[PDB]
Amino acid sequence: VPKRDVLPDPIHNSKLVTKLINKIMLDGKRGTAQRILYSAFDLVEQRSGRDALEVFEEAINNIMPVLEVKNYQVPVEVRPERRTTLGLRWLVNYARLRGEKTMEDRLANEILDAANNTGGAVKKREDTHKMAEANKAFAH
Amino acid sequence: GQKINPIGLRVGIIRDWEAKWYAEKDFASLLHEDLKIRKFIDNELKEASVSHVEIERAANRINIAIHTGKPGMVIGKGGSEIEKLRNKLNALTDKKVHINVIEIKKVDLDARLVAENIARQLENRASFRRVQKQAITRAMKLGAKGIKTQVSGRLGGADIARAEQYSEGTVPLHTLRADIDYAHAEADTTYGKLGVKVWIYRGE
Amino acid sequence: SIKKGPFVDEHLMKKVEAQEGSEKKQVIKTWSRRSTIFPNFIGHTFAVYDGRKHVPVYVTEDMVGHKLGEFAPTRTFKGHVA
Amino acid sequence: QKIRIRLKAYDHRVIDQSAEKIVETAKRSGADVSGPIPLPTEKSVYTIIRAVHMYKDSREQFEQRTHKRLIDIVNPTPKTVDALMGLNLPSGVDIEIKL
Amino acid sequence: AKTSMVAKQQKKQKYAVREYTRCERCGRPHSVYRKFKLCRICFRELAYKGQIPGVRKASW
Amino acid sequence: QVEYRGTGRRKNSVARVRLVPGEGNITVNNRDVREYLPFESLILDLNQPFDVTETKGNYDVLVNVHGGGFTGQAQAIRHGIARALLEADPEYRGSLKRAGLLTRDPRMKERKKPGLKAARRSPQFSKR
Amino acid sequence: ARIAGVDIPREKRVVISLTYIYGIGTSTAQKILEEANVSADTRVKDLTDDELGRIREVVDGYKVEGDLRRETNLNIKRLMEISSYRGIRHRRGLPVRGQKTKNNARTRKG
RNA sequence: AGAACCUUACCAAAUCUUGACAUCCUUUGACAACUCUAGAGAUAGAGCCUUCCCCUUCGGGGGACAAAGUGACAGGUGGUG
RNA sequence: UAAGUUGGGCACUCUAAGUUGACUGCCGGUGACAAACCGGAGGAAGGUGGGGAUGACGUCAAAUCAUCAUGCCCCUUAUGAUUUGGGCUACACACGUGCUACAAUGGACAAUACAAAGGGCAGCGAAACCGCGAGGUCAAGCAAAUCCCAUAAAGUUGUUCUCAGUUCGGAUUGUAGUCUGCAACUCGACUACAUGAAGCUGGAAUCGCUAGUAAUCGUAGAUCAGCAUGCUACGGUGAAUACGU
């Protein structure tokens, strides 16, 4: 039941960066993951120059799903914490699957595109919407 | 295993070690020398039913204390047999010894003594059941907080390995402030081996 | 690996020295597991005991890629159908 | 000068009693006895398989306690030597007198 | 069998390193401790017997 | 002047935190924190003592620390700072009890049990 | 290619070009950079007059055109010519030091 | 919780049969270190030395054995959880 | 003072043995008022703080006569045994475990930091010299909070490789050396060089993890004359997830 959450963050402005540094921490190594996410921060602040807070908030406010499934399938209301966690997990999954050249070009493109409410992020969003709305036959 | 001899866990907390000497990296020599005296103990075991011995190693001297079943002839009439035992031990262990015989607790309430008693009684073609009844009767007469004796193997001249237990009173095993005496013995007449483990619970 | 130079047994060497002083012999019963290739065994034959029966094998002139310790596997058929 | 000793027995009770009697005997005829300096008391490790023919994963843990106790006495005198050599009935202690 | 191994390890050896530290009371070839010259099970048997003054398990 | 003392013991890391007057800063082993502790931009947590305790008057820190990892050493500074703030005056003892970071965390690496491997993973199941 | 051997990738760094084919190899990188100075100035082929001045001499002793091929060919010729105490285990994939082959997949074997 | 030999229980060869080992009786006794030879090695022949060391009132015991005879035997990783 | 090497103290940490302490021991509410339940305060430990040994009756004709003993049957000039070779490990193979990569969170290069535990007397080899490295050689201290094994890796500080069967990758064999072993071939390990297959996260199925957790990266010990991708112990970074049966 307890979550053992972590409050502080090197960039105090957003606490989602705690989840970021935690999930990108694969293979037990933190320094390089934090370095590459800082690089993504810098590039997204550079490409289409704006504060990364607004583009990140657009990504974390447009790619949030409302339809999920929990041999029967039923749509279920999502808790906000689980919704944000799944969104960040999908963001890191897109970062892995894109497989681009530089450390952070994929990450910055992902966050910018999600802020645009277009791309594979919204493609997965509508996949969740239509897959769950197909399961509504068990709601009654 | 499911059940392990509790005196293994008991030692080091309330009770002392079976063998005691000074600490050094040359423990192999000390243990291999002590094994010879432990095997030699059987000579006094077969006639006096000594429960066990605590052996001590002084700066250059060895001190032992046997728990005999009766001190009269282990000490001799006036010391007619202790000197030859000391000499034999000195020859066998290649070092002298300081024998200090003490009689086991006056009541036959200890573990190894009664274990050997019932082992010999079984080997003498006596009903293990009646022997156990007598043993538990005198155990509760003498006064003990808890006593059980298990047996295993081919009892009563059979070919089936069965086990029995006959306990009495409160016998806390999982409890550590128990101060118990676990024993073991082996007995047979013509059929295999018949192991017995006598347990004594005297005071807490 | 290699120590004390080439490894020998110092008794097969006695037999080979005794049989090499005269005309060379083509029959030598031996075990040949603690010996190595060296130029003094040229022109001779050895019967290395693989474990069932020692089988003579003649020494060739190109003993750089072969060792006299083993000529055939002691695992007959090498424990396989093929 | 000073005289230091090192004690090794597998029971902290016998070592504590031995240190106490050694200190008392040394201070009986003199003074300036340094106390029972504690030392880290490293241990050992013995992993023993709790089986005979199978069951390697089921094991048992053993060890060997190695207790080190250092007591110093300054201004050495033969009286403290006699006090130290008085009696070592808990011979589990490994009396190693040094200077 | 091992009845001749108990003497073979005690008999002469062809060179310096030809023997193994087998158990003394036991004859178990494998899993022996060179510090005590006793096998795996013999150490446990005597430790349960309290012969060695060493401390008990469950001290960590 | 007066100098307070505190200590932090967590994750087998002990920091002998000594507090001195000044602008408010640290010298880990007479050295700066930024390069001694690798990738330690987390000093926001380390200065949270100044932002939440004793108004915002920063107090210089001298720390001699050995043992444990760099992150465990960093969190060990927090315990010593909090202890020094406690012993300065008991007024904020209750607030620190209500502000967190005062109850020492006894959570350290535990023992290794048989059944695990290089990855601390329990044995598998007899499948197929 | 032009420098030596058979073919060399174009617009690439020297450190991988010298190891693209049978040659000096990249494990000798420290030795070659200690002896010679021609290295990966940049990821493209910047071979100029200053370059190749002495790297060819430094690597000259390592004649790798068909030397490894002839060495291996003569080794296998001796293997299948002379008694094959190793040749018998060379069919099953066993080295001189042994492999204890149990998972004989279809890579080295038919 | 250590398979090159020893390791290992199997095969082949050199091989003995109270046997490789150990005890009980006696001829008795501090147990042979090193070399040459036949022998794949074992083992065997020897040169050589092991060699009352402790009590010894002179033996003897023990105490080891150098080899031998003796009836038991020892032995089985032969089997049976 | 390069450095706790030195004079000075045990101040801090740490260091081993006595003592308080988390025990429901207090408050409010709930609860048949009781037990008990919930929240709280104090409090490091709030509802047994965490981890480890202690595994009831018994079930499995579960395993061990091959630790040992063990009744019975058999060989006992062989079913006992001295010595030499191998063999338990062979491969059209399959199996399960474990190790290594499929990568650019990465690889490669250079400066740079944090740990505890264990063993050590002929063993642990200070410094140093040599060598292509393995390692060769000489050499300090130490029956151990002194000295050694022994450096912590990731990580911080800069660079390069730029998406390829890749500066990924080391399976494969060949050449020349090193430690130990009289002996490294069935049959140890390591090194310097070359060669460079598959594998670009894996289908149905499928295992593991609830907090200092997994995952990851290092260290020490036994096993050993030398040989650990196996085991144990120690240390570093360090997350979300349990709404609900």
GROMACS .gro file of N, CA and C (backbone and C1' of nucleotides) in nm, chain C residues 8 10-25 27-28 38-42 44-46, chain H residues 37:
model
   88
  352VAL      N    1   6.003  -3.526  -1.977
  352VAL     CA    2   6.027  -3.666  -2.007
  352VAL      C    3   5.998  -3.749  -1.882
  354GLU      N    4   6.243  -4.009  -1.802
  354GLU     CA    5   6.380  -4.045  -1.764
  354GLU      C    6   6.403  -4.195  -1.754
  355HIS      N    7   6.307  -4.277  -1.795
  355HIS     CA    8   6.329  -4.421  -1.806
  355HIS      C    9   6.298  -4.475  -1.945
  356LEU      N   10   6.194  -4.423  -2.011
  356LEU     CA   11   6.178  -4.448  -2.154
  356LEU      C   12   6.296  -4.393  -2.232
  357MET      N   13   6.354  -4.283  -2.185
  357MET     CA   14   6.473  -4.228  -2.250
  357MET      C   15   6.588  -4.327  -2.243
  358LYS      N   16   6.600  -4.401  -2.132
  358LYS     CA   17   6.703  -4.503  -2.121
  358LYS      C   18   6.684  -4.612  -2.226
  359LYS      N   19   6.560  -4.659  -2.243
  359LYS     CA   20   6.532  -4.763  -2.341
  359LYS      C   21   6.560  -4.713  -2.483
  360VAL      N   22   6.518  -4.590  -2.514
  360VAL     CA   23   6.539  -4.537  -2.648
  360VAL      C   24   6.688  -4.516  -2.674
  361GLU      N   25   6.763  -4.472  -2.573
  361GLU     CA   26   6.907  -4.456  -2.589
  361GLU      C   27   6.975  -4.591  -2.610
  362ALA      N   28   6.932  -4.694  -2.536
  362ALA     CA   29   6.991  -4.826  -2.551
  362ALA      C   30   6.961  -4.885  -2.689
  363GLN      N   31   6.840  -4.865  -2.739
  363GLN     CA   32   6.801  -4.921  -2.869
  363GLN      C   33   6.842  -4.834  -2.987
  364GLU      N   34   6.888  -4.710  -2.963
  364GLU     CA   35   6.929  -4.622  -3.071
  364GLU      C   36   7.079  -4.626  -3.099
  365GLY      N   37   7.159  -4.679  -3.006
  365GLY     CA   38   7.302  -4.687  -3.030
  365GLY      C   39   7.337  -4.779  -3.145
  366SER      N   40   7.271  -4.895  -3.152
  366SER     CA   41   7.282  -4.985  -3.265
  366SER      C   42   7.181  -4.942  -3.372
  367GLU      N   43   7.159  -5.027  -3.471
  367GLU     CA   44   7.058  -4.999  -3.573
  367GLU      C   45   6.921  -4.978  -3.507
  368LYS      N   46   6.848  -4.879  -3.557
  368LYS     CA   47   6.726  -4.835  -3.491
  368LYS      C   48   6.620  -4.945  -3.492
  369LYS      N   49   6.539  -4.948  -3.386
  369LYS     CA   50   6.436  -5.048  -3.367
  369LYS      C   51   6.299  -4.989  -3.397
  371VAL      N   52   6.011  -5.139  -3.286
  371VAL     CA   53   5.918  -5.190  -3.186
  371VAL      C   54   5.961  -5.138  -3.050
  372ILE      N   55   5.873  -5.062  -2.985
  372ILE     CA   56   5.898  -5.009  -2.851
  372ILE      C   57   5.767  -5.013  -2.775
  382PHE      N   58   6.064  -3.428  -2.948
  382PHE     CA   59   6.199  -3.373  -2.947
  382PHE      C   60   6.283  -3.454  -3.045
  383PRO      N   61   6.391  -3.395  -3.099
  383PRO     CA   62   6.456  -3.455  -3.217
  383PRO      C   63   6.519  -3.591  -3.195
  384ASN      N   64   6.529  -3.640  -3.071
  384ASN     CA   65   6.596  -3.767  -3.048
  384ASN      C   66   6.507  -3.888  -3.075
  385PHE      N   67   6.378  -3.867  -3.102
  385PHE     CA   68   6.286  -3.977  -3.130
  385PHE      C   69   6.263  -3.998  -3.279
  386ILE      N   70   6.339  -3.930  -3.365
  386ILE     CA   71   6.324  -3.948  -3.509
  386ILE      C   72   6.370  -4.088  -3.549
  388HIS      N   73   6.230  -4.372  -3.511
  388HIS     CA   74   6.189  -4.480  -3.422
  388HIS      C   75   6.038  -4.498  -3.428
  389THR      N   76   5.990  -4.596  -3.352
  389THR     CA   77   5.848  -4.625  -3.342
  389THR      C   78   5.810  -4.641  -3.196
  390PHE      N   79   5.688  -4.600  -3.162
  390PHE     CA   80   5.638  -4.608  -3.026
  390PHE      C   81   5.499  -4.668  -3.026
  860U        P   82   7.174  -4.894  -1.369
  860U      O5'   83   7.120  -5.043  -1.363
  860U      C5'   84   7.207  -5.152  -1.391
  860U      C4'   85   7.147  -5.284  -1.349
  860U      C3'   86   7.011  -5.317  -1.407
  860U      O3'   87   7.016  -5.361  -1.542
  860U      C1'   88   7.012  -5.367  -1.177
   0.00000   0.00000   0.00000
